[PDB]
Design a protein around this nucleic acid. Sequence first.
DNA 1: GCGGC
DNA 2: GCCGCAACGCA
Length: 287
Amino acid sequence: EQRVTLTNADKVLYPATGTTKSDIFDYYAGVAEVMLGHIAGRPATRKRWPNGVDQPAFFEKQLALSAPPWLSRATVAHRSGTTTYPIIDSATGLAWIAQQAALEVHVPQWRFVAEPGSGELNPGPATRLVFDLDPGEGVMMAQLAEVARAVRDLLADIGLVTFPVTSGSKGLHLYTPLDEPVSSRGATVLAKRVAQRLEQAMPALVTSTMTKSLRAGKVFVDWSQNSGSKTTIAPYSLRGRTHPTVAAPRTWAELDDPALRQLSYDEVLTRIARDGDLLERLDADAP
DNA sequence: GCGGC
DNA sequence: GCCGCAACGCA
């Protein structure tokens, strides 16, 4: 029986805009339906600002022993330790998220799948690819959206559909559902090849190695977040920046608008009221 | 934000 | 009151 009590409702987590815990709480109730599909079955990494975006935050992955018993969870082994993650898959789970002041929710591109037998959750294959397009110092949007279309076209050549999401920060994330789910290892190799093929077509506009030295006036097409041990901001997640911006799904037509900007939480709310989930095809097989 | 100390 | 609360890929 899922219950969550909001405390400090009027406490401001975004000093610049007066955005409160209750605002955040309402936002996540507002997006639950369209957001859940994309984080369902996935280990939820939280980044938390209990005292607002002008105060120290922390990453949290392990689930606290005192977190509500009804939260679904699963365990991931990694290079030097085990970790039990929460899995958010209900509106109440996003209520907890908001009460926790977990402004940001991050997930990998794979989901847990049950063991043949009786339900032990283990990491499954990548169900989608993500690309992170990071604009170097002084990089035009004409450069950013041109690169995003180029990635789209490459992926289309191999039968894949691509959905753009402004990261709410500086980035631009592109997601592709896989009709043939593959290992995170394979997905990474595939993504790397795409990033690299693109680099070769427009070396002055695109780079595929992260090294900050080759990162000025160029778009860095980051392919590495398809690694199974990496994580990416969830679609619809708030960002812990001075403004309550969101990893907002966009249309390709919107990318054609030179007046493309990062959206705030409330703009996202009305867009949903207008168009529902642009990312509806992304996780059509979600739990 | 919240429990362990 | 104080403190922790992640751990990639190679920096």
